Amino acid sequence: ETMSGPLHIGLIPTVGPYLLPHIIPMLHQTFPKLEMYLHEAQTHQLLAQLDSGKLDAVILALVKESEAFIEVPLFDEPMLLAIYEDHPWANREAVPMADLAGEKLLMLEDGHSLRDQAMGFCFDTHFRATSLETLRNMVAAGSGITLLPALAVPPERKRDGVVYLPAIKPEPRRTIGLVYRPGSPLRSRYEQLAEAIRARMDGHFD
Amino acid sequence: ETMSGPLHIGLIPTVGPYLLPHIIPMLHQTFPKLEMYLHEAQTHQLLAQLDSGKLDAVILALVKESEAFIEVPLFDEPMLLAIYEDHPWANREAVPMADLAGEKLLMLEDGHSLRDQAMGFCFETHFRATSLETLRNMVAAGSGITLLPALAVPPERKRDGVVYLPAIKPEPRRTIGLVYRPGSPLRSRYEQLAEAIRARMDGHFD
């Protein structure tokens, strides 16, 4: 009922830390009687817990598995390219995917709906990052290039020895949605929540 | 030139993402023939891998267990208090540890040499954050207050609904050090490495 009481939400590692600072302060001053509880795990994990009843809702990149549940699209997040300053394309304005296919990049470990989402798998490499940050910094160390969700990219085009430039033709995207168990009595609750978020993140990538 | 070849370094979650952007670009343009490989795990995990040889060096907050190895102090990192704007102390200039003696203190889960750090004695609560970020944002949601390593604190005193103010009498500290296997033939290697870092981080909190 009324937006009051303990709410247990889980976000996947590649979303939580970059999305939260944008919507949390807003949600607090719009649902003051909402007792927040932020959890963090991989998609399989968060999905299992949602099913058990441990979690009230989960925010992640919609995938095949999140199909069994009620999915609520929050926003589409584009993915930019990340390269070290000493790279040829460092001065480009955008890079077409075609230019990548012929080269290899650093990826996150299996279990992160980013590897199993990089426009199929046209992109071996017996070293995986486990965090998006560890990944970002490998780029700084000039050990390779990678794709990163827009929200994890700083406002500056260049920073800490890394350059972030648009990926186009096609622009890689992933859909961030809110997911809750079908039937849940608190269906309206979750609903307004997804509403508030969807609102605040509208036309955020312009 | 000895600083050439693949180097595998592991940082604990509460250090890596906040320290790396400060020293990685610098190390790259100081040991260009150095092939970086950043790993991330907990203190027990990293320490075990260092012993196996899987890792060349580990950067973490020195603890009792990192005693068996060669420890190299890099810098002492103070810890600030983090509270939500709507908090009484929000306008204070500093808070003595004594005032904390009785309050809602959110902490990292077991397996993080921050909890176990527990300078003083408080009230010990049944919720643990798993990431420093998930922790930071619980503060934003106004679910409690917490201590955070200085490097994980933004320049602005206030930000995204959170206020960061000094902790004093005493100022909580932790020592970040580089650790490598005793005997290792590349002893000099690691040595220069810790040198470089210690240099760049000298007087970073003044």
Swiss-Prot record, chain B:
The GO cellular component terms are:
cytosol; protein-DNA complex
Q: Where is the signal peptide?
A: none
Domain of life the protein comes from: Bacteria
Keywords per UniProt: Activator, Disulfide bond, DNA-binding, Glutathionylation, Oxidation, Repressor, S-nitrosylation, Stress response, Transcription, Transcription regulation
Instruction: Specify the inducers.
Output: Negatively autoregulated. Transcription is negatively autoregulated by OxyR binding to a short region upstream of its own coding sequence (at protein level).
Q: What does this protein do?
A: Hydrogen peroxide (H2O2) sensor. Activates the expression of a regulon of H2O2-inducible genes such as katG, gor, ahpC, ahpF, oxyS (a regulatory RNA), dps, fur and grxA in response to H2O2. Represses transcription of phage Mu mom gene in a methylation-sensitive manner; MomR binds to the mom promoter when it is unmethylated but not if it is fully methylated. Binds DNA in the upstream regions of its target genes; more than one site may be present per gene. OxyR is inactivated by reduction of its essential disulfide bond by glutaredoxin (Grx1, grxA), itself positively regulated by OxyR.
The entry's protein name is DNA-binding transcriptional dual regulator OxyR
The organism named in the record is Escherichia coli (strain K12)
Which gene is this protein's source?
oxyR
First-to-last residue of the parent protein present: 87 to 298 of 305
